[PDB]
Enzyme design. Sequence first.
Site, PDB file in Angstrom:
ATOM      1  N   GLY A   1      50.894  27.089  56.387  1.00 17.31           N
ATOM      2  CA  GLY A   1      49.493  27.411  56.448  1.00 17.31           C
ATOM      3  C   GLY A   1      49.101  28.318  55.009  1.00 17.31           C
ATOM      4  O   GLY A   1      47.996  28.605  55.248  1.00 17.31           O
TER       5      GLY A   1
ATOM      6  N   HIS B   1      45.369  18.053  49.001  1.00 17.32           N
ATOM      7  CA  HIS B   1      46.715  17.345  50.160  1.00 17.32           C
ATOM      8  C   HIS B   1      45.793  17.914  51.440  1.00 17.32           C
ATOM      9  O   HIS B   1      46.502  17.411  52.504  1.00 17.32           O
ATOM     10  CB  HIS B   1      47.830  17.577  50.090  1.00 17.32           C
ATOM     11  CG  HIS B   1      48.322  19.332  50.273  1.00 17.32           C
ATOM     12  ND1 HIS B   1      48.332  19.801  51.479  1.00 17.32           N
ATOM     13  CD2 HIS B   1      48.758  20.128  49.250  1.00 17.32           C
ATOM     14  CE1 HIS B   1      48.931  21.061  51.227  1.00 17.32           C
ATOM     15  NE2 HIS B   1      49.107  21.070  50.035  1.00 17.32           N
TER      16      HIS B   1
ATOM     17  N   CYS C   1      49.043  27.386  52.041  1.00 18.66           N
ATOM     18  CA  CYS C   1      48.636  26.490  50.866  1.00 18.66           C
ATOM     19  C   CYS C   1      47.466  26.856  50.513  1.00 18.66           C
ATOM     20  O   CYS C   1      46.294  27.160  51.472  1.00 18.66           O
ATOM     21  CB  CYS C   1      48.675  25.085  51.293  1.00 18.66           C
ATOM     22  SG  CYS C   1      50.500  24.368  51.322  1.00 18.66           S
TER      23      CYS C   1
HETATM   24  C1  LIG Z   1      59.061  22.709  53.063  1.00 17.02           C
HETATM   25  N1  LIG Z   1      57.956  21.842  53.260  1.00 17.02           N
HETATM   26  C2  LIG Z   1      58.010  20.735  54.203  1.00 17.02           C
HETATM   27  O1  LIG Z   1      58.976  20.951  55.073  1.00 17.02           O
HETATM   28  C3  LIG Z   1      56.868  20.080  54.500  1.00 17.02           C
HETATM   29  N2  LIG Z   1      55.781  19.985  53.343  1.00 17.02           N
HETATM   30  C4  LIG Z   1      54.650  20.443  53.683  1.00 17.02           C
HETATM   31  C5  LIG Z   1      53.588  21.065  52.656  1.00 17.02           C
HETATM   32  C6  LIG Z   1      54.366  22.201  52.113  1.00 17.02           C
HETATM   33  O2  LIG Z   1      55.544  22.219  51.444  1.00 17.02           O
HETATM   34  N3  LIG Z   1      54.055  23.351  52.732  1.00 17.02           N
HETATM   35  C7  LIG Z   1      54.131  24.612  52.468  1.00 17.02           C
HETATM   36  C8  LIG Z   1      53.713  25.617  51.566  1.00 17.02           C
HETATM   37  N4  LIG Z   1      54.348  26.782  51.500  1.00 17.02           N
HETATM   38  C9  LIG Z   1      55.256  27.235  52.158  1.00 17.02           C
HETATM   39  C10 LIG Z   1      55.831  26.468  53.270  1.00 17.02           C
HETATM   40  C11 LIG Z   1      56.779  26.938  54.156  1.00 17.02           C
HETATM   41  C12 LIG Z   1      57.244  26.355  55.076  1.00 17.02           C
HETATM   42  C13 LIG Z   1      56.573  24.956  55.301  1.00 17.02           C
HETATM   43  F1  LIG Z   1      57.286  24.387  56.508  1.00 17.02           F
HETATM   44  C14 LIG Z   1      55.581  24.696  54.535  1.00 17.02           C
HETATM   45  C15 LIG Z   1      55.270  25.232  53.542  1.00 17.02           C
HETATM   46  C16 LIG Z   1      53.782  20.006  51.478  1.00 17.02           C
HETATM   47  C17 LIG Z   1      52.807  20.148  50.442  1.00 17.02           C
HETATM   48  C18 LIG Z   1      53.046  19.163  49.291  1.00 17.02           C
HETATM   49 CL1  LIG Z   1      51.676  19.112  48.040  1.00 17.02          CL
HETATM   50  C19 LIG Z   1      53.974  18.480  49.134  1.00 17.02           C
HETATM   51  C20 LIG Z   1      55.110  18.480  49.910  1.00 17.02           C
HETATM   52  C21 LIG Z   1      55.016  19.299  51.161  1.00 17.02           C
HETATM   53  C22 LIG Z   1      56.038  19.222  52.250  1.00 17.02           C
HETATM   54  O3  LIG Z   1      57.112  18.883  51.861  1.00 17.02           O
END
Ligand SMILES: CNC(=O)CN1C[C@@H](C(=O)Nc2cncc3ccc(F)cc23)c2cc(Cl)ccc2C1=O
Lengths: 305, 298
Positions: free
Chosen positions: A143, A41, A145
């Site tokens: 950040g 991603h 990921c």
């Molecule tokens: C809570 N997430 C979001 O609001 C946006 N979001 C971005 C991204 C994601 O989850 N990254 C994050 C990873 N770990 C901790 C996170 C803490 C906070 C945060 F805002 C983002 C985090 C993502 C990756 C994939 Cl493969 C699928 C979906 C998403 C997604 O929904």
Amino acid sequence: SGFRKMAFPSGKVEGCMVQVTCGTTTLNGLWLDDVVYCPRHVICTSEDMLNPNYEDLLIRKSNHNFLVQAGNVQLRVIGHSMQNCVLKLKVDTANPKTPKYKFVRIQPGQTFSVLACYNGSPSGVYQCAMRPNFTIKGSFLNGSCGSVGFNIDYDCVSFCYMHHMELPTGVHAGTDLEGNFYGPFVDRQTAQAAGTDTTITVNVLAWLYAAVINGDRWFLNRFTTTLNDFNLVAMKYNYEPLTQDHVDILGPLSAQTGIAVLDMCASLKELLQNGMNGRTILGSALLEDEFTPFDVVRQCSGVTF
Amino acid sequence: SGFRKMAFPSGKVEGCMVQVTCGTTTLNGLWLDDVVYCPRHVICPNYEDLLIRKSNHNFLVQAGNVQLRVIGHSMQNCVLKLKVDTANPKTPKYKFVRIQPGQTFSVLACYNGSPSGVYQCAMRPNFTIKGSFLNGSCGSVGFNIDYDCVSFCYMHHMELPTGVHAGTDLEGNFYGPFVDRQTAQAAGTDTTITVNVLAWLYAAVINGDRWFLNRFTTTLNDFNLVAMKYNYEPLTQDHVDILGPLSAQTGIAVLDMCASLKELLQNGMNGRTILGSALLEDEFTPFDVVRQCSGVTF
Ligand SMILES: CNC(=O)CN1C[C@@H](C(=O)Nc2cncc3ccc(F)cc23)c2cc(Cl)ccc2C1=O
Ligand SMILES: CNC(=O)CN1C[C@@H](C(=O)Nc2cncc3ccc(F)cc23)c2cc(Cl)ccc2C1=O
Ligand SMILES: [Cl-]
């Protein structure tokens, strides 16, 4: 004496963390030999995240679109390929700090250390377990990921997890190092939810044996149970079923303490029924399930107190 | 989201761990520049009298699969300093710092000069640490990382009868009224680190756990009478000042959060948890909470 949630020393993993940037997205990568592994991603925008066609986004990229930074040094990308949900960036320099390693896929109930990273820089290390619903209860911010989960038995690092996302309940989802997700999750910002979670029964039993080893027996009783009657009760408290494999796995701890697995199962049933009554077990007022039978044997003494 | 007991990355410390053997005793040493630091009880007491008998070749120092040659030895308080002929090429930027009770640090538990685990803990008000150590762990060290500098704050020396641990700073001064000898020693009655519980309540609010918040506020005087009744350390104006940033981030004044803590102490949790715990957690400092809820890297 003592019993702590202990992580593996993180040095062998720190020497593999890099920063991967593609356009406006920056995340972490794992640099082993001449390959950098990261969540696919990284090629997405936030708009793309609803229904991304990764094959279509990837074909539009060239090697020089991926910026890889190892410390203060820019690594040159000379090739790229996708394997499931992981992007593999071929670089022109083998990591001189590459430890002896393996990629292993773990099962729910298994524990591992997480080296949380931001911008290719490690910030912390903690210990956690793959929950029965395939999520992990981590501590990750935006950040993080590409941060990885691992075990280090002897001098070999076994990489078992790469962080991809946070679900609406605050729990985390990710893949093995071959890019296969743990759980029914997808790397899409679609409506996804963790299934109802359960307690890892074999791990709570192991932790009750760790308490006996460290000198505590207040919770034991004179009863035994059949395996079926144990499962009929424990499933009423949202505990995972205990299989004959789990009973076999607890064999060594049973021989060390002199307490039969089905007798320890009877103390567990009573603890679920009565609570702790103001008492603690290994400094905890809850039944702990993030220590495996293998973790207990590794951390505890060979001689019961 | 999420809140874990998080240790600093241990790599800079792993590159300093060595095995020290003197006679039948084997323990861990910290190799920084051309000096190996280890508990002086490796020679075991009248330590000056036992040390004078020893020669450099009696100390066997092993760094990985390489034998280091000891070319000198001296004692500083309860730490033995072994001068070696090779400077550690992996020596990080470092300082020796003495910490205060309530402060937290990471411990790299070691056996035979080989690191086995890393955990986070706090220096208790009674100066003991609730660690996880077996025989052979002596010489394992506690540390913090600030930027790229490792601040060494603890070296493990012994386990007390209750299963808790005692040790020194890296200048060999014990934390607590302990001595390095097998004698009748006991940890004093411990207390809860109040400023740390408050910081962890702010961390819970930041993570969406707000059931314990109430409309009430209190005074430092009233709250300290409650804290003294429940074996909690007194809260000072310095602690209130230190909690200022977390109070501004959540909108909950420190004495407003003290009224929540007072209600939790007098009534319990009522079957509820805070950050997955049924006990009030005191091993996260206000700085640990700010760092873990901001993602500071090393
Ligand atoms: C809570 N997430 C979001 O609001 C946006 N979001 C971005 C991204 C994601 O989850 N990254 C994050 C990873 N770990 C901790 C996170 C803490 C906070 C945060 F805002 C983002 C985090 C993502 C990756 C994939 Cl493969 C699928 C979906 C998403 C997604 O929904
Ligand atoms: C519980 N220990 C003992 O009965 C013997 N003992 C040995 C030694 C000591 O505590 N080492 C240990 C350190 N950490 C965990 C230990 C777990 C178990 C263990 F047997 C020894 C451990 C020691 C060092 C000094 Cl500076 C002063 C006194 C002693 C001492 O009394
Ligand atoms: Cl597994």
